[PDB]
Amino acid sequence: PDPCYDEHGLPRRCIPDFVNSAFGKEVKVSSTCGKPPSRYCVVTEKGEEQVRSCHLCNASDPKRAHPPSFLTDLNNPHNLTCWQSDSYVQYPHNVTLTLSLGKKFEVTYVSLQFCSPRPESMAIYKSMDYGKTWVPFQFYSTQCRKMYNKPSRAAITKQNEQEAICTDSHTDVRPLSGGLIAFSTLDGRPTAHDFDNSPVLQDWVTATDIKVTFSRLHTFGDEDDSELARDSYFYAVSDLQVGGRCKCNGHASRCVRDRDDNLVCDCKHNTAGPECDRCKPFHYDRPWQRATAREANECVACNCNLHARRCRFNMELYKLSGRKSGGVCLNCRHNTAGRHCHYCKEGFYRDLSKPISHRKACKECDCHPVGAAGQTCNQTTGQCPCKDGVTGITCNRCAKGYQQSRSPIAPCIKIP
Ligand SMILES: *[C@@H]1O[C@H](CO)[C@@H](O)[C@H](O)[C@H]1NC(C)=O
Ligand SMILES: *[C@@H]1O[C@H](CO)[C@@H](O)[C@H](O)[C@H]1NC(C)=O
Ligand SMILES: *[C@@H]1O[C@H](CO)[C@@H](O)[C@H](O)[C@H]1NC(C)=O
Ligand SMILES: [Ca+2]
Ligand SMILES: [Cl-]
Ligand SMILES: [Cl-]
Ligand SMILES: [Mg+2]
């Protein structure tokens, strides 16, 4: 039935399936050819020598068009579909593709398959917010310092596992077609074998949005002086994939769509939030944790003895509890008061025929106006303070050895 839970009832860690989060998703592209229609030449090889061809890009024409929708469409090797950029975009100048996922993902690989020859310099970035800000995932260039101001193949140390390497790898042509770029978020990082227990990595792989930027271009022609180049140079890619899973903090087996049309974890274990990053309301007894293989870490309910609908977590009480219970109740109802709403407030006492949860569990003090030396009774017992000859819970009768008078000042008087 439910993978988020045991054979019997018990919370166990759960993860959504690894998928290609890009598939069929519309990517935004800085440029697309065919408006206005345009000719493009491509120089290529029969292995010993250079052969050059020519073609047209027409947005209008399906057979001769190349939309951004071809980046994520179903990839068939034998029948290829390529997005193609404009021409005469080249350093400085970049073509940029961004993919909004609408929700936070754990990204394993970002991978590209190029129709043109691969870029001399390109960069992958991610966004953790919703497309406001961008931090570098990885750089690719022949000259790293000159292009991106990054050292060449910088070692990754435990000290910083979140820096982006810039490599000269995957900058080569050949291939002038079908070159792959595969970026791995966890590759060469010292705590990756430990990922589940490695928060900084768990942060690293977390993205809402993914951006690819192509900067410098190979010139495969390749006259000096005044050369109005006979050859156009562009960027063309048949496939863009980002592999990974919806980020649920181990608290969900799946993500789903809202009544508000938003992708969110279908959150289990008494958790809430788009990432399951925090506890569901009234569930504040212990603090929030990421589910692990060893520990499910379900948010547990506050105990209000059915007298309060909201509570808050107190870390200090949690600690002094032996890290057992930290919740305290808010705005107890039904004339109760205290951490757990476990006692009646002043002016009331605890009727002990009724269970602590009972809505009537706290009776109003009924303290007899004449036989009692004061109005507020004992919260736990119900006993009113009793003037000298008087007894009863309510201070309503005379003791043995005492006789009743008609006086409101002195109701019970000792015999001889
Ligand atoms: C592009 O192809 C379309 C086919 O619908 C054709 O009508 C047009 O003449 C071609 N060139 C353009 C759009 O100028
Ligand atoms: C290539 O794919 C398109 C997609 O509709 C199809 O119309 C076309 O016939 C395919 N070409 C071949 C040779 O299979
Ligand atoms: C193009 O890329 C440069 C460096 O790649 C980047 O700083 C810039 O934001 C991009 N284009 C713009 C915004 O002019
Ligand atoms: Ca394609
Ligand atoms: Cl093409
Ligand atoms: Cl390579
Ligand atoms: Mg092409």
Swiss-Prot record:
According to the entry, every stretch annotated as the Laminin N-terminal domain falls at: 10-245
Residues with glycosylation annotation: N58, N79, N94, N378
Disulfide pairs here are C82-C115, C246-C255, C248-C265, C267-C276, C279-C299, C302-C311, C304-C329, C332-C341, C344-C362, C365-C377, C367-C384, C386-C395, C398-C412
Glycosyltransferase as a keyword? no
Q: Which GO terms describe its cellular component?
A: actin cytoskeleton; basement membrane; cell periphery; cytosol; extracellular region; glutamatergic synapse; nucleoplasm
Keyword terms: Cytoplasm, Disulfide bond, Glycoprotein, Laminin EGF-like domain, Repeat, Secreted, Signal
List, for all copies, the residue spans of the domain called Laminin EGF-like.
Answer: 246-301, 302-364, 365-414
Q: Which GO terms describe its biological process?
A: anterior/posterior axon guidance; Cdc42 protein signal transduction; cell-cell adhesion; chemorepulsion of axon; glial cell proliferation; inner ear morphogenesis; motor neuron migration; negative regulation of axon extension
The UniProt record lists the keyword Zinc: no
Localization, UniProt:
Secreted; Cytoplasm
Q: What does this protein do?
A: Netrins control guidance of CNS commissural axons and peripheral motor axons. Promotes neurite outgrowth from commissural axons but acts as a chemorepellent for trochlear motor axons. These effects are mediated by distinct receptors.
**How is this protein named in the record?**
Netrin-1
Species this chain originates from: Gallus gallus (Chicken)
- Lineage per the UniProt record: Eukaryota, Metazoa, Chordata, Craniata, Vertebrata
Note the residue range shown relative to the complete protein. 40 to 457 of 606
